[PDB]
Design a protein around this ligand. Structure first.
Ligand code: ADP
Ligand code: ADP
Ligand code: NET
Ligand code: ORN
Ligand code: CL
Ligand code: CL
Ligand code: CL
Ligand code: CL
Ligand code: CL
Ligand code: CL
Ligand code: K
Ligand code: K
Ligand code: K
Ligand code: K
Ligand code: K
Ligand code: K
Ligand code: K
Ligand code: K
Ligand code: MN
Ligand code: MN
Ligand code: MN
Lengths: 379, 1058
């Protein structure tokens, strides 16, 4: 018997079993509806400081593998599941989930009523919590730490996971047949994009490369100036954890790029940033969007796409500046999903066009970005 | 975008009688479509020869046609109704096939009927194996190495090329109809010949083997705007090589990485796009090599399926309702999601927080000489579904809900059997219906997970799970009841162990475990189905039990509730008829104001549609599961009289345990079912019963039998012994003894009793004599030969019996009429399979009326007090599964083997029979050569039959003794040699297409086993045959009518009634 316990801010306790590292974990608790893709999710930087709950009971069926890692590490503060399978059964598995968790030093709990947990969060909105896994998990203590959690509202997490120094990425997407490909040679990539790293998912980068982009990853706080100097064919604003709001540096910089003619594309946190820099307002959602079955309509074409979502904050549609047209909305709650500058070559998407995990439906969002780029070069 | 306007009226092609491979799933889907289109204000016209369907209830559509599903007949319906469009994707293969014939025959053009949901070309593209293969290659999807054949010569060369073993798949078939696995040339020619003939397009697809790869299915929906969704993914438990319908399957997929899932999801959509399905749902099947993720496209079905029903139940996403709406111009984003209170659109992909398990239901014990091994051709007669938070929990619940007497992983072999490992091995290697239990036995016997994998190819992910359960059972056996502390017991419950299973292991009574649970306060909680993994709230109460923390049942304190127990999976004899009653009880009482609670786990049925009731418990219909629901719902009454045997066997225990059972008492039921109690009641009432005895020993029977008199009806399986020598003979291979009533008319009587009066629902005269199971007999309403005086006598006995037995609701009485004498065969104190047919024939919803009675409202009070005798004849005919089990002798007898039935409506008996016959898919012609080969006692009436055939223009052939008889009467048929006689023989003649009709009546085990070739050949060659002289006369009569001459709607039928 290896105990584990999860306590929410409200005092609600979930007793189960430890499946990861011994220790404690504190974070905002969220639920994810993805039936597949647990590894990619765990390795998503956007999950920093967040305790991840998966609705699909059986988590770990396929094991783990390096190819399924969205970042260099596990960003999830903790993992909450219903059942940890006896075995992993997939030709691609290189290590079982439990082993993997331990190795990444993640506090994880299994065997809890995840459903009850999910309905609670939906009903009452996000909550902060704490998981304690050890010999004698102290409930009171757990409550203490949860309660003491600062909260993600107003928390700038982007500066926390961003890269120390700039770097170049030239690697493309995985194939069943060829796995993860060998990094391309610079002369092979037509365009050169500059990517702000606000805790970037490797699949975004890879898919950009697939489109003929050679990247230059830059720290979050990099100055527009320093950037402009590079002569970018395009600028990209990545996804990331925390409140987009407090990231003044980025906002400021973006504003600077907006005065130029250089194409700009932001995904998720980068969508929020763009919006902010355009004079819009962001809010913290009740429980947010985390899953991969989210319908999003391209209001323009009147077509729906099933998308991969992962956000706790959104852009207020009602405060949008006139230079900011709406391009996409959620079919689930009507929330703002995409926007494009009426006057500039800048646009963004709240969801994850790069999926990973998730439906490939929204991939073409990248395509538009390329267009902008190719046309920017024409000029 | 919104509904189409150049469409007002729509004809929906129904599926026809239930057969293996094409079951209840179509009444569910057909009903959903009716409902959907009707809701949208369209004029609905449908055709379905199957009377036991809710879809054919007069109140579900505008023009209901219970007529044979033949293009010529359908033509008359179109000509008469002039529908604008036709929706052919809701009635399985029958509907697709029929829509295309109608198209081929130019009928659609002729009346300006538009094909909606899918187009004729799309259909063919998917249906034509060659075309489908070509399309996959065009879209870069991989298919197994294969080749097309249209002849045996051609097929042989494909084989030569792919080698053995190889997979044979006819074009324009499903449920593996006409296919199989050929391990050798012999097997190979048999299958190929069979499928070429069966194939509507006379075309096969022969593939190399992928046996053992993983099998997957995806349910897709696409709108005209090109929106596309995955409603559900299914991972099969049983690997490729065993048809999806005969496999254990689960949702969602379990062992695919997200990366693999996306590729499969993308492919799925690509396939629909390429085939051309633009407005509906489709199923896409694949094969995955577990070793390298290699993906292969198997097929696609351009319509709703058995999988789509399972998928709708599993997710809560009403596929068919949605598709019907899309068929008329609606788009996904425009439709609302039913269960999420309409708060969200239908344009989304469902997410579920539990595991869904489907287990097929077989009936091999009913087909002795059949090949009982699982293959690519479906053999299952039904299926069960279960929901659990875990796979363990999900699987065990399904096991216990299958209705085969299992409480879970009950043992099949003895631990201390020296040959056990050998038997297990075989069962594993060559899968039969019992494999799942043998898997557990294997682990008990010391075989490892890898050893089991190697034999079965079932993913280790599932296997380890089963092993763990065994290991847990062994502890239970060791610790016994004393070891059953709260902690452990709870662990056990969480893994889905049944109280009954635990009791057996612990060596106690099931009620002791249940008591133990009450002590510890160890009860399940109920979760709801919501399509989104709790991300959104739901107002629907579609629930399942699980051992968790939070309960979502939230029962009302408000209304008086009425619980209706379902029959679980369908099996031969316990079909859709019982579910139709269940559905009507719910619809009636709900309409009457009660709060209706349904308990069932059959994924194929309308009973398990969230729409049918107020509350739905998708649970195994067992004492344990039911008590738990009762425990929390505290209903006013429970109806156990409508779901067949299942709920019936529970009645006593339920009552004992304090359940408020309504209608006929469990005691009352027992009175009727207990042959002893019964014999006293008949006795009590001074009624006639065949002489009977209860023999213990052989030599006791031989004596008693002398007493009783031959022939004899030995009832433990049932047989009919003719002589003393026959008795022993039986005894060898081999108790109630019953004088068999030779040359007697069998009759069914359906009625209702409210304790005050008895209402005669209907008197049905079977065509086949007593001896041929009532369930396999054709029948007439009203009687076609029975005198009024005698029927009156039966009506009286029904009354007497009703009161005496204390009937409260439905009852059915079976009689035999011999020499103007009424004999009682049996009394079934509940709703019978004939109930829906009688309701259809008479216009009275017996199930609804009887439900009200049970609930407390009298016949007088409801105003249903007079027996209805319609103005037209109603004939019922059955469909038998023999063509699925070639080894089996396609002969009728005392045991029921049919899967479905049809209804024929005519101005005369002849016309009604004609329609019924054609409706049953009879190959009967009005010309040709007939073959007569009858038994002794028939040799006398045959003459008249012969003359009748002669009058029609048939030529006759006959065997020796038959020819002798005819000759003496002045009819000289052409002599034909029995096989042992020389040549040519019947077998030869039959095979060479000489005959268009066969009449063969046999008597005596030996005479039967002898004549087995005639029947077998007739079936193989598709010649219409009758195995009863009585049946022959009916056939004869029907030659004088034209089933395509006139069609009538149910609404019109009901209107002629006075
Ligand atoms: N190449 C193959 N090797 C082994 N089994 C196969 C192969 N192709 C198909 N099967 C099996 O045969 C079944 C029936 O084939 P399918 O195309 O689905 O026919 P149907 O239309 O009758 O359902 C599949 O569900 C599968 O288990
Ligand atoms: N004594 C008998 N004489 C003639 N036919 C009989 C006799 N008993 C039963 N049968 C035949 O056997 C069939 C099945 O018998 P039954 O008692 O009704 O069993 P079940 O419960 O399966 O309906 C009847 O429908 C009838 O054709
Ligand atoms: C599937 C049912 N049939 C094939 C379409 C044969 C019984 C209808 C005739
Ligand atoms: N109603 C039973 C089916 C009849 C079949 N033609 C036979 O006579 O055996
Ligand atoms: Cl819990
Ligand atoms: Cl078919
Ligand atoms: Cl391979
Ligand atoms: Cl045994
Ligand atoms: Cl214990
Ligand atoms: Cl067979
Ligand atoms: K727990
Ligand atoms: K038309
Ligand atoms: K097909
Ligand atoms: K091929
Ligand atoms: K299978
Ligand atoms: K069934
Ligand atoms: K009969
Ligand atoms: K019976
Ligand atoms: Mn098919
Ligand atoms: Mn199939
Ligand atoms: Mn009977």
């Amino acid at each position: 018997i290896k105990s584990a316990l999860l306590v929410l801010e409200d005092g609600t306790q979930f007793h189960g079993r430890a499946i990861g590292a011994t220790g404690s974990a504190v974070g905002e608790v969220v639920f994810n509806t993805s039936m597949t893709g647990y590894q990619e999710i765990l390795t998503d930087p956007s999950y920093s400081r967040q305790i991840v709950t998966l609705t699909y009971p059986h988590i770990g069926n396929v094991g783990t593998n390096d190819a399924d890692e969205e970042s260099s590490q596990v960003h999830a503060q903790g993992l909450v599941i219903r059942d940890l399978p006896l075995i992993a059964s997939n030709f691609r598995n290189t290590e079982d989930l439990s082993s993997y968790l331990k190795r990444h030093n993640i506090v994880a709990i299994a065997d809890i009523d995840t459903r009850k947990l999910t309905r609670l969060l939906r009903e009452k909105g996000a909550q902060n919590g704490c998981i304690i896994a050890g010999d004698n998990p102290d409930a009171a203590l757990a409550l203490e730490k949860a309660r003491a959690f600062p909260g993600l509202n107003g928390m700038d997490l982007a500066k926390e996971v961003t890269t120390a120094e700039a770097y170049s990425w030239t690697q493309g997407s995985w194939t069943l047949t060829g796995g993860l490909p060998e990094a391309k040679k610079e002369d092979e990539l037509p365009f050169h994009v500059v990517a702000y790293d606000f805790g970037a998912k490797r699949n975004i980068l890879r898919m950009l490369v697939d489109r003929g982009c050679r990247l230059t990853i830059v720290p979050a706080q990099t100055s527009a100036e320093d950037v402009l100097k590079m002569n970018p064919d395009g600028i990209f604003l990545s996804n990331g954890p925390g409140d987009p709001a407090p990231c003044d540096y980025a906002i400021t910089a973006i504003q600077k790029f907006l005065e130029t003619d250089i194409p700009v594309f932001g995904i998720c946190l980068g969508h929020q940033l763009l919006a902010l820099a355009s004079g819009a307002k962001t809010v913290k959602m009740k429980f947010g969007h985390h899953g991969g079955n989210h319908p999003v309509k391209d209001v323009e074409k009147n077509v729906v796409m099933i998308t991969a979502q992962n956000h706790g904050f959104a852009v207020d549609e009602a405060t949008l500046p006139a230079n900011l047209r709406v391009t996409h909305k959620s079919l689930f709650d009507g929330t703002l999903q995409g926007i494009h500058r009426t006057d500039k070559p800048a646009f963004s998407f709240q969801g994850h066009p790069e999926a990973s995990p998730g439906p490939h439906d929204a991939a073409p969002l990248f395509d538009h970005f390329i267009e902008l780029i190719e046309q920017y070069r024409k000029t | 975008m919104p509904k189409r306007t150049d469409i007002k009226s729509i004809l929906i092609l129904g599926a026809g009688p239930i057969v293996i491979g094409q079951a209840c799933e179509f009444d569910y889907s057909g009903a959903q479509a009716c409902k959907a289109l009707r809701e949208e204000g369209y004029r609905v016209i449908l055709v379905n020869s199957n009377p036991a369907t809710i879809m054919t209830d007069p109140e579900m559509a505008d023009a209901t046609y219970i007529e044979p599903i033949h293009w010529e007949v359908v033509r008359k319906i179109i000509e008469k109704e002039r529908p604008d469009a036709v929706l052919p994707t809701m009635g399985g293969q029958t509907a697709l096939n029929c829509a295309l014939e109608l198209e081929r025959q130019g009928v659609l053009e002729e009346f300006g009927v538009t094909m909606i949901g899918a187009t004729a070309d799309a259909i063919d593209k998917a249906e034509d194996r060659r075309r489908f293969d070509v399309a996959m290659k065009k879209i870069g999807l991989e298919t197994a190495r294969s080749g097309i054949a249209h002849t045996m010569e051609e097929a042989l060369a494909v084989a030569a090329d792919v080698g053995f073993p190889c997979i044979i798949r006819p074009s324009f078939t499903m449920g593996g109809s006409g296919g199989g696995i050929a391990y050798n040339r012999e097997e190979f020619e048999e299958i190929c010949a069979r499928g070429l003939d069966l194939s509507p397009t006379k075309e096969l697809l022969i593939d190399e083997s992928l046996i053992g790869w993983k099998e997957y299915e995806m349910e897709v929906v696409r709108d005209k705007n090109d929106n596309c969704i995955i409603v559900c993914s299914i991972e099969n438990f049983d690997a490729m090589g065993i048809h999806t319908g005969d496999s254990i399957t689960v949702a969602p997929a379990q062992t695919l990485t997200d990366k693999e899932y996306q590729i499969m999801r993308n492919a799925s959509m690509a396939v629909l796009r390429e085939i051309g399905v633009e407005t509906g749902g489709s199923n896409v099947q694949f094969a995955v090599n577990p070793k390298n993720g290699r993906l292969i496209v198997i097929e696609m079905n351009p319509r709703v399926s058995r999988s789509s029903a399972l998928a709708s139940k599993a997710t809560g996403f009403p596929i068919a309702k949605v598709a019907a709406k899309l068929a008329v111009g609606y788009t996904l984003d425009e439709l609302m999601n039913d269960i999420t209170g309409g708060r969200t659109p239908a344009s989304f992909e469902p997410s579920i927080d539990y595991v869904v398990t489907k287990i097929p239901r077989f009936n091999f014990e009913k087909f002795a000489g059949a090949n009982d091994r699982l293959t690519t051709q479906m053999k299952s007669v039904g299926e069960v579904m279960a929901i659990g938070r875990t796979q363990q929990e999900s699987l065990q619940k399904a096991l216990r809900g299958l209705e085969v007497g299992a409480t879970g992983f009950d043992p099949k072999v003895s631990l201390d059997d020296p040959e056990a490992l050998t038997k297990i091995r075989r069962e594993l290697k060559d899968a039969g219906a019992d494999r799942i239990w043998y898997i557990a036995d294997a682990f008990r016997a010391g075989l490892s997970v890898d050893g089991v994998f190697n034999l079965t190819n079932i993913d280790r992910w599932f296997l380890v799970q089963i092993e763990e359960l065994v290991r847990l059972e062994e502890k239970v056996a060791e610790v016994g009841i004393t070891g059953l502390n709260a902690d452990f017991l709870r662990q056990l419950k969480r893994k889905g162990f049944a109280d009954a299973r635990l009791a057996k292991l612990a060596g106690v009574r099931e009620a002791e475990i249940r008591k133990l649970r009450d002590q510890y306060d160890l009860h399940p909680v109920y979760k709801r189905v919501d399509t989104c993994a709790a991300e959104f709230a739901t107002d629907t109460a579609y629930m399942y039990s699980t051992y968790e923390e939070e309960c979502e049942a939230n029962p009302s304190t408000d209304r008086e509730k009425i619980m209706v127990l379902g029959g679980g999976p369908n099996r031969i004899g316990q079909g859709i008829e019982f579910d139709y009653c269940c559905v009507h009880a719910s619809l009636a009482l709900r309409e009457d104001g009660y709060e209706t609670i349904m308990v069932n786990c059959n994924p194929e049925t309308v009973s398990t549609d969230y729409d049918t009731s107020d509350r739905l418990y998708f649970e195994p219909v067992t004492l344990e599961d039911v008590l738990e629901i009762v425990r929390i719902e505290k209903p006013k009454g429970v109806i156990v009289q409508y779901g067949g045997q299942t709920p019936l066997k529970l009645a006593r225990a339920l009552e004992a345990a304090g359940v408020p059972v309504i209608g006929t008492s469990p005691d009352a039921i027992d009175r009727a079912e207990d042959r002893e109690r019964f014999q006293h009641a008949v006795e009590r009432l001074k009624l006639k019963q065949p002489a009977n005895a209860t023999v213990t020993a052989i030599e006791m029977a031989v004596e008693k039998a002398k007493e009783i008199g031959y022939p004899l009806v030995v009832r433990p399986a049932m047989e009919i012994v003719y002589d003393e020598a026959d008795l022993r003979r039986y005894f060898q291979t081999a108790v109630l003894l019953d004088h068999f009533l030779d040359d007697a008319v069998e009759v069914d009587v359906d009625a209702i009793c409210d304790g005050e009066m008895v209402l005669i629902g209907g008197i049905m005269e079977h065509i086949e004599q007593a001896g041929v199971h009532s369930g396999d007999s054709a029948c007439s309403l009203p009687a076609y030969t029975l005198s009024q005086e005698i029927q009156d006598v039966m009506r009286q006995q029904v009354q007497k019996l009703a009161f005496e037995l204390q009937v409260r609701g439905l009852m059915n009485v079976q009689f035999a009429v011999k020499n103007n004498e009424v004999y009682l065969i049996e009394v079934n104190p509940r709703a019978a399979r004939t109930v829906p047919f009688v309701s259809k024939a008479t216009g009275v919803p017996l199930a609804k009326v009887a439900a009200r009675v049970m609930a407390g409202k009298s016949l007088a009070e409801q105003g249903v007090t007079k027996e209805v005798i319609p103005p037209y004849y109603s004939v019922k005919e059955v469909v038998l599964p023999f063509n699925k089990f070639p080894g089996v002798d396609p002969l009728l007898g005392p045991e029921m083997r049919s899967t479905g039935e049809v209804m024929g409506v005519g101005r005369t008996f002849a016309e009604a029979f004609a329609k019924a016959q054609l409706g049953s898919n009879s190959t009967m012609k009005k010309h040709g050569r007939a073959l007569l080969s009858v038994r002794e006692g028939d040799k006398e009436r045959v003459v008249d039959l012969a003359a009748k055939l002669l009058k029609q223009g048939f030529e006759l052939d006959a065997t020796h003794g038959t020819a002798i008889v005819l000759g003496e009467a002045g009819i000289n048929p052409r002599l034909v040699n029995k096989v042992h006689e020389g040549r040519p023989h019947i077998q030869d003649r039959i095979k060479n297409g000489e005959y268009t009709y066969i009449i063969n009546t046999t008597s005596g085990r030996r005479a039967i086993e002898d004549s087995r070739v005639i029947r077998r050949s007739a079936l193989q060659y598709k010649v219409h045959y009758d195995t009863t002289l009585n049946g022959g006369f009916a056939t004869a009569m029907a030659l004088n009518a034209d089933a395509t001459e006139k069609v009538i709607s149910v609404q019109e039928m009901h209107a002629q009634i006075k």
